[PDB]
């Protein structure tokens, strides 16, 4: 089923959004992608997630002339310890000259309807999270 | 008392008529053949063993 999902991502254009756990580091093969969104990391594995970024994003034809043909986003929660991890981690990628521009706010979120628009949903989500301690 | 599965069949009324037919007059053989072929998987299976009891049943006067 793992390879089934991988081939669905590779071949089916309807499904082009794959969520992968920590097994995406080296436990299997990553098809070439263009948008990599990292939500949670090990917590300071400056080489592990940098290697994950390197393996996920591969050379793609069509936008070679442009200096930005692969897109990587790292979601970090403000005022949390996670920030301290990210600056600790991407340091390795800084050693290779890679830059990370801080995007506090995303343009266009207002018009498009998204989940958890009401806080009443969000407090139910909090209920769910705290249920697992 | 040779307890056999044909003991019910031996005293089975339609089978009693069949054994009476076999005993004396084989004229009504096609009727029994039609009956057994149409529906007698149980008779097909059970007639395989205990032939002596089956014959003695056919010999009932």
């Amino acid at each position: 089923e793992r390879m089934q999902i991988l081939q669905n991502f590779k071949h089916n254009p309807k499904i082009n959004t794959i969520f992968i756990s920590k097994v995406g580091d080296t436990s299997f093969d990553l098809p070439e992608a263009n948008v990599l969104i990292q939500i949670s990391s090990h917590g300071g594995s400056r080489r592990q997630e940098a290697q994950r970024l390197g393996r996920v994003l591969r050379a793609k034809k069509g936008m070679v002339a442009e200096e930005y043909n692969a897109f990587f986003y790292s979601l970090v929660s403000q005022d949390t310890q996670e920030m301290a991890y990210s600056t600790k981690r991407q340091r390795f990628l800084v050693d290779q000259g890679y830059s990370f521009k801080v995007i506090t706010k995303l343009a266009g979120m207002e018009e498009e309807d998204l989940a958890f628009s009401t806080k009443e949903e969000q407090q139910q989500l909090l209920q769910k999270v705290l249920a697992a301690t | 008392s040779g307890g056999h599965p044909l003991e019910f069949l031996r005293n089975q009324p339609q089978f009693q008529q069949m054994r009476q037919i076999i005993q004396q007059n084989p004229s009504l053989l096609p009727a029994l053949l039609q009956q057994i072929g149409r529906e007698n998987p149980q008779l097909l299976q059970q007639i395989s063993q205990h032939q002596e009891h089956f014959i003695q049943m056919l010999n009932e006067p």
């Binding site: 407090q123 909090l126 | 053949l33 057994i36 097909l44 395989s48």
Partner: protein, 490 residues
């Protein structure tokens, strides 16, 4: 041209449904054909019971007394040991001159067969040809002649001690010692011929009277096993008589017709044509050079034709090929890997030629004996156990589920017990029944298995109890959080 994957899925569904329905059709045809065959066998049993009833009626003593009274002193003084062909012919002629054919006599189903025969004796008449046969049987039983009533599905067989032969006698047609003539005057469809003695002993005499028995009726009669089982209870106590009859039949039918048709030589061990063999069966030219010919086809003895199996199959049969044995037949080899490889390229499909061996070329398999508490293993790392004798001495098979887990836990050398082969999708996976262990630790392993069974029982108990406790805890914490957040906003 539109959604090819959907079309392929539709084709696969049609294929699987077609295979299912076709195998169902074959099974249904097998079922109904078997029902027809069993109905035919039951009809044959009914005919046999009718013959038994006729013989029992013909065994009455009143009919014997009537026959003895009617028979003149000229035929009475001739003992069965002195009965010859001329005496049989004279008695048949007297019977013909005594009782005639007259179907005009009044007949009623109410009248019993015995009473009807007694009345016919009283009026010296008859009603039907079978009635004449029965009357002649009664006349013969009046003199206590060793005679059997033979029916075709009719005549009599007289066991003459001058020749010790069951001579055929037919009263209506004046037939004496003419079995082939009996083929004409009996029932035209001759698939069964049964001779019942006055005591009810049943013998098969189809071969003597049917010239086509050894060729067609041999392959077109009822099942041998079922009919042999049917005739087993009524086997005549005269075992010597049965042996003599079998020897006489063998002497008569030893290559008597001498067929020379190519089709007849197929599936006929008395001839055993070289081309009419199987893939595994093969002739022996050493003991069979030439015995006959049919359209340029040579004949070899069946005793020179032998069946063969592979070395692996011989081991499955608890047989080990001797060293240096030559392949009796080099034939097509087919196993999962071999079949796939041969499908890959046909040039080696003919070139495989696995070499089978004869039974005489292989000795009985000798299982080893465990030494130093070590269970021997094959190249596959196991022991083939198709038969209990195949087990090495000093070994014990235990069919305890999950026992090898304890064995490795206790560091006890335990192997699987290869029983056979199973193939669900087309591959002969070996099949094992339990674990082979050393005999020394047999009871220790049993004790360990009992201890581990009890331990896993109590562990399951505590696991489910802790599951219930965890569910309680989760529900309690969920309610706590619900109350806390409601208090936070209300």
């Amino acid at each position: 041209i539109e959604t090819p994957e959907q079309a392929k899925t539709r084709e696969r569904s049609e294929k699987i449904k077609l295979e299912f329905e076709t195998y169902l059709r074959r099974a249904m045809k097998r079922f109904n054909k078997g029902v027809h065959e069993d109905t035919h066998k039951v009809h044959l049993l009914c005919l046999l019971a009718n013959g038994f009833y006729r013989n029992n009626i013909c065994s009455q003593p009143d009919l014997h007394a009537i026959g003895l009274s009617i028979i003149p002193a000229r035929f009475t003084r001739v003992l069965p040991r002195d009965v010859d062909t001329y005496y049989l012919s004279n008695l048949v002629k007297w019977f013909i001159g005594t009782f005639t054919v007259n179907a005009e006599l009044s007949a009623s189903e109410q009248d019993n067969l015995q009473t009807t025969l007694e009345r016919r004796f009283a009026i010296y008449s008859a009603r039907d040809d079978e009635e004449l046969v029965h009357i002649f049987l009664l006349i013969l039983r009046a003199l206590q002649l060793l005679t059997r009533l033979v029916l075709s599905l009719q005549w009599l067989e007289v066991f003459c001690e001058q020749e010790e032969k069951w001579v055929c006698v037919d009263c209506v047609h004046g037939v004496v010692g003419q079995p082939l003539t009996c083929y004409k005057y009996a029932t035209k469809p001759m698939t069964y011929v049964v001779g019942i003695d006055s005591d009810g002993w049943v013998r098969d005499v189809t071969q003597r009277y049917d010239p086509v028995w050894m060729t067609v009726t041999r392959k077109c009669r009822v099942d041998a096993e079922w009919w042999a089982e049917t005739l087993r209870p009524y086997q005549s106590p005269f075992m010597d008589r049965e042996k003599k009859e079998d020897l006489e039949f063998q002497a008569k039918h030893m290559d008597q017709p001498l067929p020379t048709a190519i089709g007849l030589y197929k599936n006929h061990p008395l001839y055993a044509l070289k081309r009419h063999l199987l893939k595994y069966e093969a002739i022996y030219p050493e003991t069979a050079a030439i015995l006959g010919y049919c359209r340029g086809e040579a004949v070899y003895s069946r005793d020179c034709v032998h069946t063969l199996h592979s070395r692996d199959t011989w081991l499955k049969k608890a047989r080990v090929v001797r060293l240096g044995e030559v392949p009796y037949k080099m034939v097509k080899g087919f196993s999962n890997r071999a079949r796939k490889a041969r499908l890959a390229e046909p040039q080696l499909r003919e070139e495989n030629d696995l070499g089978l061996f004869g039974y005489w070329q292989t000795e009985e398999y000798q299982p080893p004996v465990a030494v130093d508490g070590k269970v021997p293993r094959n190249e596959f790392g196991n022991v083939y156990l198709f038969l209990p004798s195949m087990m090495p001495i000093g070994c014990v098979q235990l069919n305890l589920p999950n026992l090898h887990r304890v064995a490795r836990k206790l560091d006890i050398d335990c192997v699987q017990a290869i029983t056979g082969f199973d193939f669900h999708g087309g591959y002969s996976h070996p099949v094992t029944d339990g674990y082979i262990v050393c005999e020394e630790f047999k009871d220790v392993l049993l004790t360990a298995w009992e201890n581990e069974q009890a331990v896993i029982e109590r562990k399951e108990k505590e696991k489910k109890e802790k599951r219930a406790l965890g569910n309680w805890k989760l529900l309690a914490k969920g309610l706590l959080i619900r109350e806390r957040l409601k208090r936070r906003y209300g």
